[PDB]
Specification:
heterodimer, A: 447 residues, alpha/beta, Arc Repressor Mutant, subunit A, B: 334 residues, Rossmann fold, 8-stranded mixed sheet, 9 helices, globular, binds gibberellin A3, plant protein, RGA, GID1A, della, Arabidopsis
Chain lengths: 447, 334
Amino acid sequence: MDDELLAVLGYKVRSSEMAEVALKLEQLETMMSNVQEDGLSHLATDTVHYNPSELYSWLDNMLSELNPSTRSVILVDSQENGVRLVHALMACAEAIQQNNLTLAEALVKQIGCLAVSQAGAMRKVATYFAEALARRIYRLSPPQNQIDHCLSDTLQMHFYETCPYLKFAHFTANQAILEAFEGKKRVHVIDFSMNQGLQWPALMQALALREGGPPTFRLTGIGPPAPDNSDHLHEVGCKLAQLAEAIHVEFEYRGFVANSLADLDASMLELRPSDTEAVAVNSVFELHKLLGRPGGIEKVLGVVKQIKPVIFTVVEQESNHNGPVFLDRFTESLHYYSTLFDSLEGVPNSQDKVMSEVYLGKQICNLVACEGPDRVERHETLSQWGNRFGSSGLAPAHLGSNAFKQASMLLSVFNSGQGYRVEESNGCLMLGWHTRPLITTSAWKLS
Amino acid sequence: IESRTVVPLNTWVLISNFKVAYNILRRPDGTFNRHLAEYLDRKVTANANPVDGVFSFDVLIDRRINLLSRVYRPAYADQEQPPSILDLEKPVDGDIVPVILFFHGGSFAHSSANSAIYDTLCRRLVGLCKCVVVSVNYRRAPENPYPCAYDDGWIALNWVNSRSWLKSKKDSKVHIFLAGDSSGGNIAHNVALRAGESGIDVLGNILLNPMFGGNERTESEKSLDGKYFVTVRDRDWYWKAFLPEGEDREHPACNPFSPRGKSLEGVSFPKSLVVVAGLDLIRDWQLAYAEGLKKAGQEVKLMHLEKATVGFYLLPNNNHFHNVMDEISAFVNA
Ligand SMILES: C=C1C[C@]23C[C@@]1(O)CC[C@H]2[C@@]12C=C[C@H](O)[C@@](C)(C(=O)O1)[C@H]2[C@@H]3C(=O)O
């Protein structure tokens, strides 16, 4: 097993390989004094590093290349009236948990009163949470209480414009996909969250100017049934095919309609033999929705294992919201959403900002009021997702520093490169407000 | 070969890895590989659930400069469920409660307040000295040169002083201790020097291998040149990257006892505790600093460890660690 002291410092080195690592460091130091300011620069700029925590493998790469729970909380120092608001919110939630309905409506009215005199992000968070608790309180005995929906079409694109969460996710997924599409003749891409298809044009454009020629590109899209009863996937395919005629590469499209992902099968996708065409699976904010169904995520993971792809990109939200106790989930969501609402304060006022705020409010309302299979906002953390994936036959695909650099460069254009910071953990990436990780991106592969 | 006989194997591995990495991130022109440095840095996150009697959380004390701070406090004795946010700033209890304001090292370039090496050092300080620890995330160089770091330290000191739940129930005042290591010693010295004329009262200073220097070469530099994980060519790189362009190493930020500095005689300076490593490169400069403090009339205790190197306080597997921790605990709770 690993030695304890380095394990707590942040370096995974086994106790029986201490002498080997020391000798490797001594060898690396020797040939760094003979090499001039050229070699060192060649290691600084050209070569790419993988898994810096594993000292043994990192040192091997350098040597061979040179000589060929935990709940984080952030307190913004701008609150001077919100203490009463948080007391009222917690009291209302506790009263709900103990069947104290009349007290709950009393506190809801009190919350409505106090939030009027406040300002900033806390007022919006309080308003949305008060509405969520009122909707919760509207579910006693009357069996005629409807809900809302998720218009992920006109709102998610507005969120894309407002916020860097989708751009960062798309960029990292595209960087990971391209690295695994080197040397292959024909490629195939399966998307579990086709939506509007605003991440594929960039990937195709980057793939066309490659050293060797643009490979054949085939794309299969899966989406929920349309709200207005139209053929949106056909239109998306038409635009993508039109954009693929200026890259000197073939293009194919396919549309799929399914209420969930648990009813899909590997036979419906019409997969060509793997030896002649690679397959890539992509998912952006679409895996946590199957946590409510009992046995849907295991079915989807089994289908993915049967597909046998070369890479599997997953982007999710980094927070624990699947706790059985209502109070703990309420507190966690309260803090996470408070931090997400405080990060959109410096953005200039625009219609896109309002639309993203409405999207977040709908998320809060669905996460709090609804219970059972109707609840789709079941977020988890990196450890939980890794435990879920590890019992299926998937291995972690450690991302490269080059992606770190590109993500940081693309993140410096937003708010003059302030607030948002990238980090790394077990071969994964994280986009967060200062020291609070909000969304993680990871890639997996067959074991 | 000589370094392997004065330190344990795992400390040697850690320090050698740090030196090799910082070798490959340094460029002769003067620029720094910031993106690669952040990729290679190992960090942790705040955790409000008490682990081994300590919990922590982050505070954003200034937004115009993105100034962060991590606060560590001991676990509550009268609270079964994990703490939340209303109880985070809960008024402390006891007659006297120390507050340690900590600045991390790294020659104004490496590491950060959220790094695991300093999160562990601060947790051990809380566990042993039994007090409150506030870690500061100051601006690094060469992106932000002199004096961004002293300004960040001053703002953090004002924020710590102005709090009301950090006070004491004996004299309605806060007990503030300044601490640091490597560049943290320099920051603490300058923050105390600027705090002596503002009115804020500081109880003491804790300097763990402070990073000072001058213009003339000492015998320690000639003899220990690059033989104990510290060379002279990289000391000049760090001093050039931090000090303003066109200034030598006789600037007051480098040599406190320089002809261009103000005398410490007749000036309100707190009691100090200087820890000096015998086997480090810049040993004579630290001893000269302690001698100057003694001569100026200020109180100062010198702890010279004859066989200690840099980074002897990052692992508990040596004998200097316990001695230094006991001395710090007796220094604070006196
Ligand atoms: C280039 C450097 C800078 C070191 C010394 C070293 O020679 C090797 C690595 C640095 C360092 C790493 C962590 C600690 O903060 C420090 C004081 C140390 O012992 O070693 C750090 C120390 C420093 O920042 O002064």
